[PDB]
Amino acid sequence: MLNTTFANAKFANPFMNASGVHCMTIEDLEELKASQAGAYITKSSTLEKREGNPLPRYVDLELGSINSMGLPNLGFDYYLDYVLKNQKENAQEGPIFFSIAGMSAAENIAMLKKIQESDFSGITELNLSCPNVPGKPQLAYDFEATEKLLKEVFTFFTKPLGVKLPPYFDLVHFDIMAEILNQFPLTYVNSVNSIGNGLFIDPEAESVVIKPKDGFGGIGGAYIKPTALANVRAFYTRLKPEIQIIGTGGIETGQDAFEHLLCGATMLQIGTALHKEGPAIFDRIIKELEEIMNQKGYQSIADFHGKLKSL
Amino acid sequence: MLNTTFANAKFANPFMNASGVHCMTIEDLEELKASQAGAYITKSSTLEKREGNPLPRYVDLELGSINSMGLPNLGFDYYLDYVLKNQKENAQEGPIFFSIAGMSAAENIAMLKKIQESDFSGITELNLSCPNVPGKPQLAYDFEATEKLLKEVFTFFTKPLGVKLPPYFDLVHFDIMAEILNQFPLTYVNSVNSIGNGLFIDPEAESVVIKPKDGFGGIGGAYIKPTALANVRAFYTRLKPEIQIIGTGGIETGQDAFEHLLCGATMLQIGTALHKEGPAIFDRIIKELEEIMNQKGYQSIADFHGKLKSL
Numbered sequence: 001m002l003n004t005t006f007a008n009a010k011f012a013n014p015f016m017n018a019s020g021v022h023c024m025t026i027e028d029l030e031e032l033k034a035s036q037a038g039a040y041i042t043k044s045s046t047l048e049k050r051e052g053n054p055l056p057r058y059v060d061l062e063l064g065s066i067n068s069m070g071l072p073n074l075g076f077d078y079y080l081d082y083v084l085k086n087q088k089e090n091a092q093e094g095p096i097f098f099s100i101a102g103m104s105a106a107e108n109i110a111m112l113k114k115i116q117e118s119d120f121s122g123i124t125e126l127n128l129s130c131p132n133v134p135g136k137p138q139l140a141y142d143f144e145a146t147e148k149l150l151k152e153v154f155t156f157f158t159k160p161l162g163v164k165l166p167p168y169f170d171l172v173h174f175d176i177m178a179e180i181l182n183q184f185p186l187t188y189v190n191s192v193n194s195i196g197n198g199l200f201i202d203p204e205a206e207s208v209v210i211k212p213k214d215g216f217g218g219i220g221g222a223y224i225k226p227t228a229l230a231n232v233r234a235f236y237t238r239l240k241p242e243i244q245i246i247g248t249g250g251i252e253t254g255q256d257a258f259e260h261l262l263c264g265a266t267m268l269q270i271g272t273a274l275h276k277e278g279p280a281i282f283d284r285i286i287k288e289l290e291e292i293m294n295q296k297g298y299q300s301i302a303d304f305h306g307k308l309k310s311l
Numbered sequence: 312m313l314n315t316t317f318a319n320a321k322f323a324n325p326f327m328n329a330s331g332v333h334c335m336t337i338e339d340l341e342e343l344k345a346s347q348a349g350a351y352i353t354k355s356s357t358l359e360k361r362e363g364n365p366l367p368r369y370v371d372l373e374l375g376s377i378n379s380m381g382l383p384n385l386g387f388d389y390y391l392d393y394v395l396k397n398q399k400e401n402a403q404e405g406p407i408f409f410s411i412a413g414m415s416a417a418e419n420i421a422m423l424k425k426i427q428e429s430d431f432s433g434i435t436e437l438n439l440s441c442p443n444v445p446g447k448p449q450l451a452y453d454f455e456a457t458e459k460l461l462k463e464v465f466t467f468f469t470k471p472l473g474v475k476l477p478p479y480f481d482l483v484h485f486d487i488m489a490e491i492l493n494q495f496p497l498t499y500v501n502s503v504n505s506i507g508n509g510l511f512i513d514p515e516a517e518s519v520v521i522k523p524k525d526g527f528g529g530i531g532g533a534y535i536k537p538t539a540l541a542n543v544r545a546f547y548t549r550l551k552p553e554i555q556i557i558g559t560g561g562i563e564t565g566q567d568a569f570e571h572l573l574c575g576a577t578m579l580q581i582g583t584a585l586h587k588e589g590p591a592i593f594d595r596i597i598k599e600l601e602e603i604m605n606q607k608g609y610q611s612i613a614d615f616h617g618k619l620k621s622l
């Protein structure tokens with residue numbers, strides 16, 4: 001019942017891991033391949049391997065999570081080499097997603113050039129929103145810089161490309177971003193990355209809970225679902241139909257998934273919940289969503305996709 | 312134990328209602344005066360009385376609330392007339408706060424000029440962040456427009472003035488705003504107003520829960536505490552000491568209050584929790600905070616104010 005068509009490809013279901021969660025190593029990736037996830041994406045990579053920020057840098061919270069990982073990853077070449085080899089095995093339905101988060105415009109262009117020249121036939125996700133890199137603000141909050149980068153990207157990148165965006169909180173910002181994005185042959189928009197620079201405090205110790213950036217980190221989980229749903233819906237009613245949407249944020253139950261789909265998301269990514277539960281979450285949430293559909297008499301996501309009703 | 316000095320005035324405790332909650336009518340205000348709240352603030356007013364947005368426009372949520380009130384208020388003259396008469400009675404310790412949220416720069420300047428010319432001896436709060444006025448984005452997200460307005464304001468406004476700000480999620484934005492604000496003889500910064508344009512969905516009805524703006528509304532409550540604490544802390548380490556801070560967002564228990572104070576807030580405002588519990592909340596939360604202080608051996612807020620520890 002969850003069969004999904006996205007980026008002109010077929011997926012068994014819309015569920016995926018969110019970049020950064022359970023996708024650091026080849027072992028992690030193979031575990032996602034073995035799970036019931038409809039598709040999976042690699043950890044955002046940089047040209048060179050990164051150790052990331054000092055620990056502790058991730059903490060589970062009652063209402064979600066907080067983190068400042070600092071883009072730890074095994075490097076662009078590691079992930080490219082992996083996806084290229086798996087591609088040749090045709091051992092999975094649906095292409096693999098490849099996330100990149102260059103430390104600079106030049107690095108992003110360099111990696112995109114390499115992907116374009118390689119035989120990679122999967123999907124690429126350009127991360128314009130990492131909120132945990134010291135001294136490096138979220139690019140997608142600089143509309144001018146974002147448009148400038150994308151224009152250069154599309155002068156050469158012809159393969160499927162999506163952009164991971166930070167959350168927006170003003171309708172005019174959605175209008176501005178949509179106008180910018182609609183001018184490009186983008187495959188999709190992924191809303192949203194973590195709510196940036198939040199803070200969690202241990203009242204007993206009177207201190208923060210993560211070491212980097214004086215305790216400031218990206219917030220995920222139940223805390224951000226209202227924002228995530230709003231972003232998915234706001235872009236759904238503004239983006240040209242050629243640009244599909246991946247919904248990310250606060251997805252833990254079939255009900256949460258149902259809500260994102262009702263808003264307009266086609267694919268769904270799970271971050272915090274997956275970090276806590278492991279790959280087994282996919283089998284659980286798929287069953288929860290199917291139960292909701294069965295109760296409503298729905299046999300396909302098309303029966304309710306994007307049909308959220310206004311009052 | 313909670314005696315507080317703010318804007319050169321003395322308050323019995325730091326607790327107040329958040330503008331917009333339990334402060335619409337004179338009756339509401341008198342109820343706050345009768346409560347244990349250390350101080351209170353009026354509903355943000357406009358030059359003309361406003362009916363606000365269509366109902367339903369406010370809904371209680373398990374993790375907080377969502378709303379799109381649309382600035383319903385009885386008009387500037389109603390509130391000014393009230394505070395002026397109440398001022399003459401000397402029936403309360405600490406000045407009353409007066410919030411204004413003009414529909415335009417001209418409207419804000421007009422109200423500020425009227426306050427300046429009146430005998431009002433209390434504190435004024437300029438709302439630069441209402442996220443529920445259709446076609447009117449949050450001014451504080453337009454740094455240029457914000458600085459331009461404040462420069463004009465301070466060419467004539469000499470009375471205590473604070474600004475209610477929306478939440479920021481990028482450290483560079485805190486830097487930019489702090490630089491702008493530090494050039495003025497501002498009395499305080501109030502962080503934060505609601506997380507803007509969030510969405511809540513009733514999965515059974517497959518629809519939004521508020522009527523205006525297709526269901527998009529300001530999010531308050533537990534959902535936003537991480538963001539609220541971060542904003543209070545980020546400005547505390549960036550603002551010149553002359554500018555104090557009012558912490559607002561996700562305050563429901565003494566522990567939540569303790570956390571805001573630990574971050575650097577001097578006064579504390581309660582929105583969602585007060586909306587749900589009523590003025591009795593002040594008695595409860597004051598006792599909860601005092602119990603926390605007693606267990607830690609603290610006899611004054613100065614014992615921990617702004618002392619949040621980094622790792």
Ligand SMILES: Cc1cc2nc3c(=O)[nH]c(=O)nc-3n(C[C@H](O)[C@H](O)[C@H](O)COP(=O)(O)O)c2cc1C
Nearest residue numbers: 018019020044192193194220221249250270271272
């Ligand atoms: C530990 C951790 C690491 C993350 N790293 C990345 C990353 O490398 N690239 C990216 O686009 N998003 C990253 N994110 C953000 C997620 O992809 C997702 O957007 C966020 O957690 C919101 O979803 P959630 O509510 O399900 O957690 C990370 C999140 C977490 C919790």
Ligand SMILES: Cc1cc2nc3c(=O)[nH]c(=O)nc-3n(C[C@H](O)[C@H](O)[C@H](O)COP(=O)(O)O)c2cc1C
Nearest residue numbers: 329330331355503504505531532560561581582583
């Ligand atoms: C029903 C309602 C009305 C509000 N109206 C105003 C307003 O007129 N002026 C203002 O500065 N903030 C207004 N706010 C926002 C609050 O002052 C406060 O910043 C927000 O609710 C975050 O605090 P909380 O987590 O305790 O609810 C309103 C909030 C609610 C829930």
Ligand SMILES: [Mg+2]
Nearest residue numbers: 033034035036
């Ligand atoms: Mg599989």
Ligand SMILES: [Mg+2]
Nearest residue numbers: 344345346347
């Ligand atoms: Mg009283």
